[PDB]
Design a protein around this ligand. Structure first.
Ligand code: ADP
Lengths: 511, 132, 132
């Protein structure tokens, strides 16, 4: 039972566990891997996840969600003031630490945002535990890259309230890069652009990865751009339509609008795989059955500026990172809203047709990375490296035929693998343009008595007297015994290779 | 009425080592006591997140240092959770035997006294400079 | 028939300090065991100067070192005065009750473990390499 990582968002969250080289992303009670960052305080119990989201229209005044905007902030913080004007619940200046007042079991208790998010984390904890069949406290929680230190501590504390051992707080874009394997090494010295288009926010972050070591070069964003306003444009389409079609002003009924919005969310998600989606609500407003539709093209028109504006922070991030388009090697998507074809088309066209990394569901990639990181942090073994080195060795020395018909070993018998070993060779005779390397396995001095594994030619060698050209021959062996023998001439940079397949007295006298 | 208790052997030995071993880095004295006060302050702060009444006895969580040279003394005040009679008796609230034994083994292996806090027995370092 | 006496608290304290100190110059182990053996041999030599009958239980004055790898022990035998039951039980016949305390003060001041023989309690250094 491995450590887990939790993707703690403003509108949604997701938990995964890392094991057997992969992260298993875990479904909630209804089969949903990603569930809402909502807690509904009712007079009987607090519902968490889909259960809270499903009743926002009925109990919005007591349902608390998007705790993150308030977490780690002071009551007087302009952000706090900006968001409290948008909530159905009351935000309270309890010592400049904004609390939310909702009725729980009949009492108008003020709940601090860290406990609201711990309620969410506790639910995510329970989801992963039910799946894994084991209680789990070892965890990584992700946060936006822009979070400051009061916010990071606040996130750790929400974890502690929930009973978690917070191994670490890591950034959302780091986790995505991890999820896509950009930290597996051999992919170093690359720039990664992460496009984080979520529910209530949009962020862009440019990372540089050097063989597993990360640096963040730049960030940019729009703190109010995300799926929620794509939903609001779809809502205005349907709300104004309803009113005009029926001469009934639905916009004034918070529940009817929320039912319409829920349909907007469903239709929009459907629309992203489709070309068309519909709205079908019985008795939506004043007993009126509202049946209508949205096409993909209409959706894009409604939201045409919301989509185009996502590239403005892209240009900003590139400016801050001092990078041109050509300097981004890896294009990465984060957030369910990037599943809309228009987003993919805009980012991909912006970067001249280059393919986006869509290999992991955008809403799972962050949790995925957190889970991988949680597993290494709980104890630093992650399908490597010491077992590979101690269990698998080169069973026979590995080397090459050299002049004289003899074998020169570069990898010694029973040496641990994976490993890379080298030696310097020159052409045997004078003024040759290249060399012939015969790769062998075995313990005999002569090559005629060894196992020929394969042969290759190293070209690009300036002719010079014997012993002058400097050729480095490398025996590069992986964990499974596969051998790659390469060679290069250090004076020209030219190289070639062969792939070898796997087997698996006087002093006592006087005068 | 004053109750007298024995120290558990692992710590009776630890305190002897602190006093009699010639450790030069006496400054860890203050470092460890301040650090331990921080832990106590967090214990309340975390409980106050689900049970705010823990702060009803005093909302301020802080560390005070107050020297009084004329009495050869320094007071360190931890406004954190504190200890009940039972915790004071039970090794000032720690797992003294497992922590200290592992530490003594670490010391036998060449560990410095500065590592005492890494075993959760950091407060016994008070005797580096304290008479009492 | 095993009679238990237990140890003087101050010497028990020194043994704990020796055992738990990271001391590398363990060669003092044999130095002190030999020195003490020598002292026993000189004391009998002096007794024989006024009372020669003390040599009729053996005359030769020597030290025998016999390593026993198969037992994981080292045997050191001296043919000196020996110890009475009383000396053996009274903290091994030395004034350990004085010497270990004085040594510990020296250790508090920065003295080395190798100075233990200067306090007449050199044989407790056995525990640097011995468990028993
Ligand atoms: N196929 C889709 N098309 C359009 N929007 C989607 C799709 N799938 C998910 N979404 C939206 O993505 C959002 C999920 O955001 P996520 O990145 O998980 O959370 P957060 O923004 O809180 O970090 C929701 O607002 C949801 O409606």
């Amino acid at each position: 039972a491995a450590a887990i990582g939790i993707d703690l968002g403003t509108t949604y969250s997701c938990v995964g566990v890392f094991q057997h080289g992969k992260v298993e992303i875990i479904a909630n009670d209804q089969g949903n891997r990603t569930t809402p960052s909502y807690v509904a305080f009712t007079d009987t119990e607090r519902l968490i996840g889909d259960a809270a989201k499903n009743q926002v229209a009925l109990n919005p005044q007591n349902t608390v969600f998007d705790a993150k905007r308030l977490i780690g902030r002071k009551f007087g913080d302009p952000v706090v003031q900006s968001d409290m004007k948008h909530w159905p619940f009351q935000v309270i200046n309890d010592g400049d630490k904004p609390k939310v007042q909702v009725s729980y079991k009949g009492e108008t208790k003020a709940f601090y945002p860290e406990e609201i998010s711990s309620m969410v984390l506790t639910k995510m904890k329970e989801i992963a535990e039910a799946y894994l069949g084991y209680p789990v406290t070892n965890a990584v929680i992700t946060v936006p890259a822009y979070f400051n230190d009061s916010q990071r501590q606040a996130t750790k504390d929400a974890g502690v309230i929930a009973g978690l051992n917070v191994l670490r707080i890591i950034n959302e874009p780091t986790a995505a890069a991890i999820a896509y394997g950009l930290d597996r090494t051999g992919k170093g010295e690359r720039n990664v652009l992460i496009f984080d288009l979520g529910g209530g926010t949009f962020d862009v972050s440019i990372l540089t990865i050097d063989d597993g070591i990360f640096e963040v070069k730049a960030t940019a964003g729009d703190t109010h751009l995300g799926g929620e306003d794509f939903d609001n444009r779809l809502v205005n389409h349907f709300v104004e339509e309803f009113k005009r079609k029926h001469k009934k002003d639905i916009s004034q009924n918070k529940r009817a609008v929320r039912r319409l919005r829920t349909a907007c969310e469903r239709a929009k998600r459907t629309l992203s795989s489709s070309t068309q989606a519909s709205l079908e609500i019985d008795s939506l407003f004043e007993g009126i059955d509202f049946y209508t539709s949205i096409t993909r093209a209409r959706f894009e028109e409604l939201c045409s500026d919301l989509f185009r504006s996502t590239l403005e922070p892209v240009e900003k991030a590139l400016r801050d990172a001092k990078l041109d388009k050509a300097q981004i090697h890896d294009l990465v998507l984060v957030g369910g809203s990037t599943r809309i074809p228009k987003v993919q088309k805009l980012l991909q066209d912006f970067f001249n047709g280059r393919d986006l990394n869509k290999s992991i569901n955008p809403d799972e990639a962050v949790a995925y990375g957190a889970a991988v990181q949680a597993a290494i942090l709980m104890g630093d073994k992650s399908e490597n490296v010491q077992d590979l080195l101690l269990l698998d060795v080169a069973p026979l020395s590995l080397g090459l035929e050299t002049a004289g018909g003899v074998m020169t070993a570069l990898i010694k018998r029973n040496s641990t693998i994976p490993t890379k070993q080298t030696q310097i060779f020159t052409t045997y005779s004078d003024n040759q343009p290249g060399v012939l390397i015969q790769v062998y396995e075995g313990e005999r001095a002569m090559t005629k008595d060894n196992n020929l594994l394969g042969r290759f030619e190293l070209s690009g060698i300036p002719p010079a007297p014997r012993g002058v050209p400097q050729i480095e021959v490398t025996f590069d062996i992986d964990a499974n015994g596969i051998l790659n023998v390469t060679a290069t001439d250090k004076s020209t940079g030219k190289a070639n290779k062969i792939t070898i397949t796997n087997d698996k007295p006087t002093i006592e006298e006087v005068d | 009425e004053v109750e007298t208790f024995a120290f558990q052997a692992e710590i009776a030995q630890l305190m002897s080592l602190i006093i009699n071993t010639f450790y030069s880095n006496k400054e860890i004295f203050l470092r460890e006591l301040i650090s331990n006060s921080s832990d106590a302050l967090d214990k309340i702060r975390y409980e106050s997140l689900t049970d705010p009444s823990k702060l009803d006895s005093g909302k301020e969580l802080h560390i005070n240092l107050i020297p009084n040279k004329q009495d050869r003394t320094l007071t360190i005040v931890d406004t954190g959770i504190g200890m009940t009679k039972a915790d004071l008796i039970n090794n000032l609230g720690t797992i003294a035997k497992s922590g200290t034994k592992a530490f003594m083994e670490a010391l036998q292996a060449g560990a410095d006294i500065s590592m005492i806090g890494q075993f959760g027995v950091g407060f016994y370092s008070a005797y580096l400079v304290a008479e009492k």
